Amino acid sequence: SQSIIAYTMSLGAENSVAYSNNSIAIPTNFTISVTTEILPV
């Protein structure tokens, strides 16, 4: 059974970047993304 529920907004996932003093993250792959933007003219 479903009901109407009220909640506080989640702004997104919490991500603690592994920032360090001499540490770097470098991508070994890539993705080709095709996104869409609709604009009234």
Binding site: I26, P27, S33, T35, E37, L39, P40, V41
Partner: protein, 238 residues
């Protein structure tokens, strides 16, 4: 090519399934239709007159007494027209701003490659393709997204012979034992060389500099043939 084909195939579903946008064009259409409907429905308001029909007032009254009802209807309908035209002007200004943005996006994403962040989609903009939509435009933004990041140790400079070496274009990285130089957006480790680096000062200024060997191909060939020349001279003399 396979990734682009997959994404462009998924576009035909995500355009109408994920919603998000494409409700802007329908919102424009709905706003215009609702404004016209309100304007044409305002003709049924009496605005204080005996009737909202002009023929009824003209048929049931003399011009002296008719004029009052006619003036009430005129005032009401003139107010309705003025309201409609003002809302139309404001909506036209909004649509003009949207169209200026769309023309800028056509110039800078379709006719070129943009360095502006998030102007032509999320990620590093590669290209864009225009499509026509009712009263609007659709931009298919093809972007590059780094995917599989790996962890590396990094240094700002490399110290070899009392000289600080900096990468010409890239970043110094280490898996733990060996030091390479790679391009900053894609892992392609190369042996640190005088060709990939430039020298600037000594190793007493840069914070975080590490010793690592910077190889010189010229000196390698030079001393490699120098050893052979020394052997030749040794065998010739004795």
């Amino acid at each position: 090519a396979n990734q682009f084909n997959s994404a462009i195939g998924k576009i035909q579903d995500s355009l109408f399934s994920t919603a998000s946008a494409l409700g802007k064009l329908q919102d424009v259409v709905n706003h215009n239709a609702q404004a016209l409907n309100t304007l044409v429905k305002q003709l049924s308001s009496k605005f204080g007159a005996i009737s909202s029909v002009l023929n009824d007032i003209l048929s049931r009254l003399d011009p002296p007494e008719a004029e009052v009802q006619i003036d009430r209807l005129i005032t009401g309908r003139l107010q309705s027209l003025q309201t409609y035209v003002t809302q139309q002007l404001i909506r036209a200004a909004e649509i003009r701003a949207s169209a200026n943005l769309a023309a800028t996006k056509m110039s800078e994403c379709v006719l070129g490659q943009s360095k502006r962040v998030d102007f032509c989609g999320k990620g590093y903009h590669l290209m864009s393709f225009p499509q026509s939509a009712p009263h609007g435009v659709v931009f298919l933004h093809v972007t590059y997204v780094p995917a599989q990041e790996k962890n590396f140790t990094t240094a700002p400079a490399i110290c070899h012979d009392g000289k600080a070496h900096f990468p010409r274009e890239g970043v110094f990285v280490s898996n733990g034992t060996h030091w390479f130089v790679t391009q900053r957006n894609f892992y392609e480790p190369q042996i640190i060389t005088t060709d990939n680096t430039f020298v600037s000062g000594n190793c007493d200024v840069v914070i975080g500099i590490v010793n690592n060997t910077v190889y010189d191909p010229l000196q390698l060939e030079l001393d490699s043939f120098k050893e052979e020349l020394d052997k030749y001279f040794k065998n010739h003399t004795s």
